[PDB]
Amino acid sequence: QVQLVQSGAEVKKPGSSVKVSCKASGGSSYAISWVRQAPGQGLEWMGGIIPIFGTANYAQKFQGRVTITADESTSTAYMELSSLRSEDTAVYYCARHGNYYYYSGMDVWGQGTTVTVSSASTKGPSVFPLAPSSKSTSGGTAALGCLVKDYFPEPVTVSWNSGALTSGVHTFPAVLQSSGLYSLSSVVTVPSSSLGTQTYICNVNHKPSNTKVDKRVEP
Amino acid sequence: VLTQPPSVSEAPRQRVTISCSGSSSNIGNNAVNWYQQLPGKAPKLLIYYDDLLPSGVSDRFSGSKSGTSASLAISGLQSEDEADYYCAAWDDSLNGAVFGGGTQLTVLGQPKAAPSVTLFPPSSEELQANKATLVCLISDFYPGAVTVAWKADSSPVKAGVETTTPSKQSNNKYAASSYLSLTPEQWKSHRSYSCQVTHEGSTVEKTVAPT
Numbered sequence: 068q069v070q071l072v073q074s075g076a077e078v079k080k081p082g083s084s085v086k087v088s089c090k091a092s093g094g095s096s097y098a099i100s101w102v103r104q105a106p107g108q109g110l111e112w113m114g115g116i117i118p119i120f121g122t123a124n125y126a127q128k129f130q131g132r133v134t135i136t137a138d139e140s141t142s143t144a145y146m147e148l149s150s151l152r153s154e155d156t157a158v159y160y161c162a163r164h165g166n167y168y169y170y171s172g173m174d175v176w177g178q179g180t181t182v183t184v185s186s187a188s189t190k191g192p193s194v195f196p197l198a199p200s201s202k203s204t205s206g207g208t209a210a211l212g213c214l215v216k217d218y219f220p221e222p223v224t225v226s227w228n229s230g231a232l233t234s235g236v237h238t239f240p241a242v243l244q245s246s247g248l249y250s251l252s253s254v255v256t257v258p259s260s261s262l263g264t265q266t267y268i269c270n271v272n273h274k275p276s277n278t279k280v281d282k283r284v285e286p
Numbered sequence: 287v288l289t290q291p292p293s294v295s296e297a298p299r300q301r302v303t304i305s306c307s308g309s310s311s312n313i314g315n316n317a318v319n320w321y322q323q324l325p326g327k328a329p330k331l332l333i334y335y336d337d338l339l340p341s342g343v344s345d346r347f348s349g350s351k352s353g354t355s356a357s358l359a360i361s362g363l364q365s366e367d368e369a370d371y372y373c374a375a376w377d378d379s380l381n382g383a384v385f386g387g388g389t390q391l392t393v394l395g396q397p398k399a400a401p402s403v404t405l406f407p408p409s410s411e412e413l414q415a416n417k418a419t420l421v422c423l424i425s426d427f428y429p430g431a432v433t434v435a436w437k438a439d440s441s442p443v444k445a446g447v448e449t450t451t452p453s454k455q456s457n458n459k460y461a462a463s464s465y466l467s468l469t470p471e472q473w474k475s476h477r478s479y480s481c482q483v484t485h486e487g488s489t490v491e492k493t494v495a496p497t
């Protein structure tokens with residue numbers, strides 16, 4: 068019944084600060100915790116607040132850079148983390164405990180808020196065709212693609228022929244380069260006989276830079 | 287602070303045990319809670335106060351606690367159960383909550399599958415922009431672990447390589463990508479470049495060459 072809704076994703080420069088909100092959609096004698104998860108990592112407790120006792124608790128790892136508050140008028144809890152570093156890149160979760168102890172299980176969870184910390188700046192991608200040839204042809208089917216190079220931040224979305232072509236499409240998760248920029252590729256396998264009769268275009272959308280590219284991919 | 291097996295393998299409708307090992311100041315004197323995390327979503331409470339079941343959680347899950355270690359049990363193991371599992375408890379010496387590192391429940395077993403590998407050379411459009419990227423796309427492999435090595439000629443190269451972690455596909459097999467960055471002159475100067483993909487001790491190599 069009760070839902071916890073968190074503010075949206077954030078992209079932050081090292082040394083800055085982020086404040087994430089967690090609004091209780093309805094349903095307050097419960098403790099609230101903040102828990103983060105670095106990509107491909109486990110869960111880490113940041114601290115909590117118990118609004119009806121007006122007391123908070125911070126893990127000592129974060130103490131001096133974290134603040135957890137709760138606003139009773141709107142039953143919104145907040146977690147502010149300052150002096151951000153690249154290792155603070157994570158999904159941040161808000162969760163409500165089953166009672167007023169932090170010992171109790173966390174039975175209601177927000178949806179998570181992605182926070183990315185990086186020194187990179189918003190940049191649209193350069194899109195290159197990956198042309199089909201004899202060397203990407205096997206058994207009468209041809210592989211062709213798009214290389215979406217050097218963009219920041221995530222996400223990019225890719226479609227083929229404005230959505231009319233879906234089967235045979237494999238859009239790969241991006242690599243994060245040492246430059247701080249991302250690159251990904253998208254490929255589609257099609258009948259080799261269709262190369263003279265059908266045109267193939269990848270539609271790349273990079274909303275953070277307000278950029279869309281339609282790239283024709285020819286033999 | 288708490289330790290779990292990083293991975294756990296078993297077959298359908300079997301029974302699995304996930305151990306959680308702590309110390310006196312956390313598991314020893316505090317309740318243990320278990321969380322299930324499905325891919326790409328928020329953790330969910332599975333077990334609370336050592337052994338109680340939330341509403342809506344299947345009877346197949348159970349927890350127990352003895353001394354400074356705890357254990358989660360799943361019986362009648364099913365495909366839905368593949369997920370990460372975390373134990374958690376309060377710690378009176380850290381005065382905070384601690385989790386275990388988590389346990390991936392690989393529910394057995396999908397057929398082994400060899401990677402399909404496609405290697406693209408740099409586009410003329412990119413070379414004309416004075417850069418060159420070799421793109422090696424690796425799909426449909428199981429289980430989800432590969433290593434990728436590149437060769438300039440028949441000589442290894444490790445400069446300019448960026449490889450992704452593997453990621454699970456729609457069909458429950460895995461995919462990865464690897465990129466080799468070169469100058470337009472490294473590209474033309476050699477007679478070929480190769481992407482070599484090793485999967486479960488066996489290797490598939492694709493080769494490309496300037497026009």
